[PDB]
Amino acid sequence: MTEYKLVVVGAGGVGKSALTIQLIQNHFVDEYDPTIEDSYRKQVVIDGETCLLDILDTAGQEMRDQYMRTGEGFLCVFAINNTKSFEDIHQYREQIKRVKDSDDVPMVLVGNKCDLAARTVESRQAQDLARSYGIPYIETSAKTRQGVEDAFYTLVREIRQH
Ligand SMILES: Nc1nc2c(ncn2[C@@H]2O[C@H](COP(=O)(O)OP(=O)(O)NP(=O)(O)O)[C@@H](O)[C@H]2O)c(=O)[nH]1
Ligand SMILES: [Mg+2]
Numbered sequence: 001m002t003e004y005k006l007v008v009v010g011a012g013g014v015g016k017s018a019l020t021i022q023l024i025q026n027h028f029v030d031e032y033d034p035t036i037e038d039s040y041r042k043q044v045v046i047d048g049e050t051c052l053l054d055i056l057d058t059a060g061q062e063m064r065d066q067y068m069r070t071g072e073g074f075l076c077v078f079a080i081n082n083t084k085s086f087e088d089i090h091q092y093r094e095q096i097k098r099v100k101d102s103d104d105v106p107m108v109l110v111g112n113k114c115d116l117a118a119r120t121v122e123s124r125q126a127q128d129l130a131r132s133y134g135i136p137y138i139e140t141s142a143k144t145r146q147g148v149e150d151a152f153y154t155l156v157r158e159i160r161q162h
Pocket of ligand 2: 016018034035058059
């Protein structure tokens with residue numbers, strides 16, 4: 001079956017693992033557990049297509065290039081309550097394009113932790129940034145599961161159109 005190699009990247013503590021585990025295990029992890037490198041494989045049916053999602057969950061701690069190279073699509077995540085994680089987004093995108101030798105790689109910008117009230121990053125500025133990159137923007141919450149499937153499925157569809 002079709003296998004989609006997805007890579008989750010972004011600053012430390014934005015919720016990369018929480019989003020992935022919510023998608024794979026149906027539960028919100030409210031634990032301090034920094035990631036070094038973890039991979040998840042799950043069979044799923046998306047729009048009638050039986051496929052295998054091979055997800056690489058990466059570390060936020062500044063081996064990256066190696067895994068970005070094989071990745072077919074990327075979820076670039078930041079937290080809506082951490083301005084620094086939003087700014088860092090640019091550095092991650094630039095590194096992905098340099099490693100993939102392309103100006104256009106399947107990508108989705110993910111604004112996580114939208115269940116929080118203390119927002120420092122307006123949805124407008126994130127949407128504007130996404131528009132300039134030419135990629136979709138989706139707000140998620142690993143806690144309420146809001147937008148979780150949306151983020152991953154949209155990335156798969158982006159890969160299908162590339
Ligand atoms: N309220 C709320 N907390 C979240 C959300 N996603 C993650 N968190 C919390 O944020 C903290 C860090 O999440 P985690 O998934 O470990 O982040 P990471 O980006 O994977 N960290 P690392 O890069 O070190 O591997 C945890 O306490 C987790 O519960 C969310 O949508 N809402
Ligand atoms: Mg993690």
